């Protein structure tokens, strides 16, 4: 699962880039805040899951 | 070296430590955007 | 007059200066004058 592990880590890196750009933008823009709130929650959850996935997939790779 | 499954992320690691300095620089950029009010 | 914001101009000029001086330090480590 080396290609799977590399894909999961690449997804984690890309999502980290997206959230690093977007969380301060969403936090500092009140005008659409409700919608961005859900995305932030989703992103955070997904990011946490990806971290866990990568950690487990560290040991089987 | 890093573990081999992380090998393709070796260049990114090579630029990771200088990220805090940029944060300091980022402050000035932000202060330039608001005109140093 | 003020179509391009001055903070963008300052950021781009400073990043160019940073790139140039980083190139100068890289050339301190490579090629002529690198002791290798």
């Amino acid at each position: 699962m080396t290609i799977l592990f590399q894909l999961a880590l690449a997804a984690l890196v890309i999502l980290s880039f997206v959230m690093v750009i977007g969380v301060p933008v969403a936090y500092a823009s009140p005008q659409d805040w409700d919608r961005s709130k859900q995305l932030i929650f989703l992103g955070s959850g997904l990011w946490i899951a990806l971290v866990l996935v990568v950690g487990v997939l560290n040991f089987f790779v | 070296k890093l573990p081999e499954a992380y090998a393709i992320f070796d260049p990114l690691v090579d630029v990771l430590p200088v990220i805090p300095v940029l944060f300091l620089a980022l402050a000035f950029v932000w202060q330039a955007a608001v005109g140093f009010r | 007059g003020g179509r391009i914001p001055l903070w963008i101009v300052a950021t781009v000029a400073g990043m160019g200066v940073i790139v140039i001086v980083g190139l100068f330090f890289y050339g301190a480590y490579a090629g002529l004058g690198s002791s290798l």
Binding site: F17, V20, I21, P24, V25, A28, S29, P30, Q31 | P11, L12, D14, V15, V18, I19, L22, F23, A25, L26, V29, W30, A33, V34 | P5, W7, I8, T11, M15
Partner: peptide, 30 residues
């Protein structure tokens, strides 16, 4: 090669000012 490190550092060093530019464009709390 070195081009990969340069691409990564360019993306990060633009990711900062991209946040600033996006906040200024949409009139954020910036």
């Amino acid at each position: 090669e070195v081009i990969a490190q340069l691409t990564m550092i360019a993306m990060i060093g633009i990711a900062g000012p991209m946040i600033i530019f996006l906040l200024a464009v949409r009139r954020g709390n910036l």
